[PDB]
Amino acid sequence: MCLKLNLLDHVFANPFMNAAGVLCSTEEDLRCMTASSSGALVSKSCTSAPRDGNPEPRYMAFPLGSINSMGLPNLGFDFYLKYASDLHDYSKKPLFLSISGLSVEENVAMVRRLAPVAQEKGVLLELNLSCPNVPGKPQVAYDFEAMRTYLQQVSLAYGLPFGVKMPPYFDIAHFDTAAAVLNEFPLVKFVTCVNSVGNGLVIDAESESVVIKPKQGFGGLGGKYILPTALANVNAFYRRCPDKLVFGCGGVYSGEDAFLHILAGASMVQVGTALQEEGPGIFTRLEDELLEIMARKGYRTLEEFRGRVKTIE
Amino acid sequence: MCLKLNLLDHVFANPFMNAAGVLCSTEEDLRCMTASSSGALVSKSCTSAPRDGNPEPRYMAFPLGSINSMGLPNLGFDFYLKYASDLHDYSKKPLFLSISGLSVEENVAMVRRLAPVAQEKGVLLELNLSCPNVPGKPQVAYDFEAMRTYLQQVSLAYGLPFGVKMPPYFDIAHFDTAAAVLNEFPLVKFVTCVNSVGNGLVIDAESESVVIKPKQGFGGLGGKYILPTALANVNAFYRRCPDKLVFGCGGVYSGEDAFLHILAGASMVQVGTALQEEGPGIFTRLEDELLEIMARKGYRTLEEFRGRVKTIE
Ligand SMILES: Cc1cc2nc3c(=O)[nH]c(=O)nc-3n(C[C@H](O)[C@H](O)[C@H](O)COP(=O)(O)O)c2cc1C
Ligand SMILES: Cc1cc2nc3c(=O)[nH]c(=O)nc-3n(C[C@H](O)[C@H](O)[C@H](O)COP(=O)(O)O)c2cc1C
Ligand SMILES: COC(=O)c1ccc2cc(CCc3c(C(=O)O)[nH]c(=O)[nH]c3=O)ccc2c1
Ligand SMILES: COC(=O)c1ccc2cc(CCc3c(C(=O)O)[nH]c(=O)[nH]c3=O)ccc2c1
C-alpha cells in the first residue's frame, strides 16, 4: 500500500509538499526539497526583480505556531524560471511555481514568459492572491472586483491550467462570493486554502516586546493556531467548487492533521510552519502516520475518504 | 500593589470579567458571576423575544479552544432589563448588558427602554456588532455602511455612553476603516476586541465527523487559537482610537495572557472559553497570577504598563 495519486495530468508519489515561502527560496532549498520524500515542491513566491524583504527579525516560531512578515524576499522570477527551465529534475517530482507580483501588469508579464516553459516542461503555476497588501485598499483576495480583474488578465496572458493561493475568509457570504468569482474561470483548476491568517501580533511577556521587527510586530499566523480555519476554508471551497481541486494548507504537524484536511476535501496537503521547524524529514513521518490511520480504518485510497467528512443529522 | 481601576464613572476591583454569552444566560448564572471575584460581569446577548437557539450539540471545547454555533439563545430583553433594574446588586460590582438585535430597529427598541435604567441604576451597554444582519450579507461589523447605520440610530436612540463588541479583522485597511467609523461616534466610549473567529471548522479524526450540528459544523472559534489575533485587534484599536477605551477578549487562560492583553492596550479583560471550561474560580487564579507577574517586574498598577508594548526599533 502507498499514497500515489494523479492530478492536473501529473503523477505524485504522495499528496505532501512544502508550502510556498518555506525552504524554497534558493537553489540549495529547492535541491533539498527535491531530494525529500515530498510528492512535490513549490518555489518561493516571486517578483520580476530580486527583493531583500523586510528587516530581521521577520519570522518566529512557538509551540503553537508561527508569525511572519518576510516582505517577499526572493531571487527574482528570472531565477525561478531558470530553475523551472534548466535545473529541475522532473523525473523526481512535479514542480509548482509561485508568482506574487505586486501588480496585475507585473503578474501578466511573468505568466507570459512562464507559459512556454509550462508547455515544454510541465511546471505548474500557483498565483498568489494573498498577495502583498495594497496601500489604501485591501489585499486582492478581500476585494473581489480586483480579484476578478487579476484572474481575467492572467487567464488571457497564460492560457493554461493554473491555480490560486487564497487567504482565509471568515464569513459565509465571502465564501459564496469568492467561490463564485473563482468559478467564473475555467483555467483555475485548483485553489490552495489557506495563506497565513493575516496580521496577528505575538508579544513576549518577559521583555514586554513584539517579536518581529516590521509593521510594529504585526504578521501572518501559521501553524497550530489556524488549523480549524484552514479546514473550514478547504471544505467551504470543496463544496462550492466541484469542477476544481482544493489543496489544503495550514497547521499540518501530523498525519492526523493531514487526514483531516483530506476529509475536508484536500487533494494535496501543504506543510509550512512544521517544515520550517522540523526540516524536510517531516515528509517521511507524515507519510507513515497517514498510512497508519488509513490502515486502522480500512482505507486503501485517498479517494475513499476525500471530502467525506460527516455532518450531524 | 493592586488591580483596581476607575473607568466610565465606575469602580472595578480588578479588570476581569466574563465574556458575553459565557455564564450569563440565566438568573442562576448571573448571581454566580456576581458572587465570583470578577471585577464585573456582562449579560448574555439578548434579542427582543426569547430564543431557543440552534440545535444541540452546539458548543464544544478542546485543549486549544472552542467552537460554537449557539444561535443567540437567551431569555429575552425583558428578563435582562429586569435583572438590571430590580435584581442586580451594583454594590458588589458593575453590570454590563449586551444587546444583539437582529436588525437595527430591534436594537433601537431595546436601547430606548434601556436608557432610563442606564441612567438610574448605572448599567452599561455593549452593542454586539458581530451580529448577523440580512442573510447573504456579511455580519454587521464587516459591512461598514450597516455598521455606520446601526451606530447613528442607536446613538440617537440611546443618548448615553455605550460600547461596542467587534469581531476580528485581518487586514490593515479594515482596521483603518473600522476605527475611522468608530471615531465618528463620541458616545462609543469603549470597544471590545474580539468576538469569536468566524466559521472555523473542527473535525474529529476517529469519528470522521464535524463536532457541532448547526451549519455543517462551521462555528466561531475561541481560546488559545485566537490569542494573537485578539492582541493584534486590541492594539490596532488602542493606537487608532486615543479617546476610547479598549476591552480585550480572546484566548485568556492565565495572568500572563491577561498581562499581554493589557500591554497591548486593554483596560478590561474578558474571559470566555477558559471560564466555560474552568468555571468562575478561574478569576481568583487569574488575579493572583497577574499580581505575581506585576510584583516580579516592579509594577504597582495596571496603567504603569497598559499600552506599553515595545516595538523593535
Ligand atoms: C516564513 C514564511 C514564508 C512564507 N512565504 C510565503 C510565500 O512566499 N507565498 C505564499 O503564498 N505563502 C507563503 N507563506 C504562507 C505559507 O505558504 C502557508 O500558507 C502558511 O504558513 C500557513 O500554513 P502552515 O500553518 O502550515 O504554516 C509563508 C509562510 C511562512 C511561515
Ligand atoms: C458558548 C459561547 C457563547 C458566546 N456568546 C456570545 C454572545 O452571546 N455575544 C457575544 O458578543 N459573544 C459571544 N461569545 C464570544 C465570546 O464573548 C468571546 O468574544 C470569544 O469566545 C473569544 O473569547 P475566548 O477566546 O475567551 O473564548 C460566545 C462564545 C462562546 C464560546
Ligand atoms: C509592510 O511589509 C511589506 O512590505 C510586506 C509585508 C508582507 C508581504 C507579504 C507578501 C506575500 C508573501 C507572503 C509572505 C511574505 O513573504 O511576507 N508571508 C506569508 O505568510 N504569506 C505570503 O503570501 C508579499 C509582500 C509583502 C510585503
Ligand atoms: C446558525 O444560524 C443561526 O440561525 C444563527 C442565528 C443568530 C446568531 C447570532 C450570533 C451572535 C451571538 C454569538 C454567538 C451565538 O450565540 O451563536 N456565538 C458567538 O461565538 N458569538 C456571538 O456573538 C451568532 C450566530 C448566530 C447564528
Side-chain angles (χ1 to χ4, degrees), chain A residues 19-21 44-45 68 70 128 165 194-196 222-223 226 249-251 272-273:
Chain A
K44 169 77 200 180
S45 283
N68 93 78
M70 311 296 290
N128 189 352
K165 183 62 182 290
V194 290
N195 209 308
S196 49
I226 73 158
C249 181
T273 296

Side-chain angles (χ1 to χ4, degrees), chain B residues 223-239:
Chain B
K224 299 201 213 267
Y225 289 119
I226 77 149
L227 183 58
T229 288
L231 299 175
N233 275 249
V234 168
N235 190 63
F237 281 98
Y238 179 77
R239 294 172 186 289

Side-chain angles (χ1 to χ4, degrees), chain A residues 75-113:
Chain A
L75 308 184
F77 167 77
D78 293 347
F79 172 80
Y80 304 100
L81 181 68
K82 183 176 162 51
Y83 183 84
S85 268
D86 314 325
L87 306 169
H88 192 253
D89 190 353
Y90 289 86
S91 69
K92 296 283 189 278
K93 65 190 75 182
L95 156 70
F96 287 82
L97 195 154
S98 195
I99 86 102
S100 173
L102 313 161
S103 49
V104 58
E105 298 83 5
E106 173 152 49
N107 290 318
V108 168
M110 289 189 278
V111 297
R112 293 206 206 268
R113 297 168 62 203

Side-chain angles (χ1 to χ4, degrees), chain A residues 136-152:
Chain A
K137 284 180 72 160
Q139 58 170 159
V140 179
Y142 295 158
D143 165 24
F144 301 128
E145 197 64 21
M147 171 168 85
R148 183 181 284 124
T149 291
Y150 274 67
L151 253 12
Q152 263 152 4

Side-chain angles (χ1 to χ4, degrees), chain B residues 19-22 43-46 59 66-68 70 72-73 98 100 126 128 130 165 192 194-197 220-224 226 249-253 270-274 276:
Chain B
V22 170
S43 83
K44 171 62 190 193
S45 275
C46 65
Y59 164 101
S66 65
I67 183 166
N68 90 76
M70 311 288 290
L72 202 48
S98 176
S100 174
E126 187 178 81
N128 182 6
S130 159
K165 168 83 170 284
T192 304
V194 287
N195 211 301
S196 41
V197 171
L221 300 182
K224 299 201 213 267
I226 77 149
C249 188
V252 180
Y253 289 63
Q270 319 193 320
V271 192
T273 298
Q276 184 56 217

Side-chain angles (χ1 to χ4, degrees), chain A:
Chain A
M1 186 178 62
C2 83
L3 315 135
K4 13 160 30 261
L5 64 167
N6 200 280
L7 35 98
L8 304 154
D9 302 314
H10 298 245
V11 176
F12 302 85
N14 63 64
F16 294 110
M17 55 190 292
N18 73 302
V22 186
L23 192 52
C24 47
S25 306
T26 60
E27 183 173 334
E28 181 192 315
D29 291 322
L30 295 163
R31 275 164 109 297
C32 178
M33 273 310 298
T34 293
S36 87
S37 284
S38 66
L41 77 173
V42 64
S43 61
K44 169 77 200 180
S45 283
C46 67
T47 38
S48 330
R51 290 167 60 75
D52 285 310
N54 292 338
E56 301 194 341
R58 60 198 185 172
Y59 166 82
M60 290 291 282
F62 306 92
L64 295 181
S66 64
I67 182 176
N68 93 78
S69 172
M70 311 296 290
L72 200 54
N74 70 102
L75 308 184
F77 167 77
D78 293 347
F79 172 80
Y80 304 100
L81 181 68
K82 183 176 162 51
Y83 183 84
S85 268
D86 314 325
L87 306 169
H88 192 253
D89 190 353
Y90 289 86
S91 69
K92 296 283 189 278
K93 65 190 75 182
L95 156 70
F96 287 82
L97 195 154
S98 195
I99 86 102
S100 173
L102 313 161
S103 49
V104 58
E105 298 83 5
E106 173 152 49
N107 290 318
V108 168
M110 289 189 278
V111 297
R112 293 206 206 268
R113 297 168 62 203
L114 178 61
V117 186
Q119 279 263 43
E120 163 84 272
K121 296 273 187 157
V123 53
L124 293 142
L125 157 58
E126 197 176 81
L127 193 71
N128 189 352
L129 295 175
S130 354
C131 165
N133 67 132
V134 182
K137 284 180 72 160
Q139 58 170 159
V140 179
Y142 295 158
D143 165 24
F144 301 128
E145 197 64 21
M147 171 168 85
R148 183 181 284 124
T149 291
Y150 274 67
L151 253 12
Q152 263 152 4
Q153 290 299 111
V154 167
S155 343
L156 230 71
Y158 190 60
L160 298 169
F162 65 102
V164 301
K165 183 62 182 290
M166 313 287 303
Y169 300 92
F170 300 96
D171 191 293
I172 304 289
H174 303 146
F175 291 137
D176 288 334
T177 307
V181 173
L182 293 175
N183 281 313
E184 287 165 35
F185 300 98
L187 292 167
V188 173
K189 298 303 200 173
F190 72 86
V191 191
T192 299
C193 311
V194 290
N195 209 308
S196 49
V197 175
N199 300 300
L201 177 66
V202 170
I203 300 171
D204 157 73
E206 171 282 300
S207 68
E208 316 170 18
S209 164
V210 300
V211 303
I212 57 174
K213 178 167 172 168
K215 302 175 69 194
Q216 297 178 101
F218 282 72
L221 298 172
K224 286 197 207 294
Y225 293 112
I226 73 158
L227 180 58
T229 293
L231 294 179
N233 279 256
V234 171
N235 190 67
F237 286 89
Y238 181 70
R239 289 184 187 273
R240 294 161 176 71
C241 309
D243 303 327
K244 304 188 183 297
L245 311 167
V246 177
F247 291 6
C249 181
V252 178
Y253 292 74
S254 73
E256 193 179 297
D257 302 322
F259 176 80
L260 299 172
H261 267 272
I262 291 161
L263 268 167
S267 293
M268 292 295 287
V269 173
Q270 307 193 342
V271 197
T273 296
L275 176 65
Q276 184 60 216
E277 290 321 291
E278 192 168 336
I282 191 155
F283 297 110
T284 61
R285 184 169 65 78
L286 300 160
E287 270 137 56
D288 286 348
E289 278 169 6
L290 181 52
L291 285 165
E292 157 58 63
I293 290 161
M294 289 163 86
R296 154 167 96 248
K297 296 187 166 275
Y299 288 131
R300 315 177 280 123
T301 73
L302 312 169
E303 168 266 338
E304 278 164 17
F305 61 96
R306 184 185 294 109
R308 287 266 215 289
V309 58
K310 303 169 180 149
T311 62
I312 289 143
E313 260 84 298

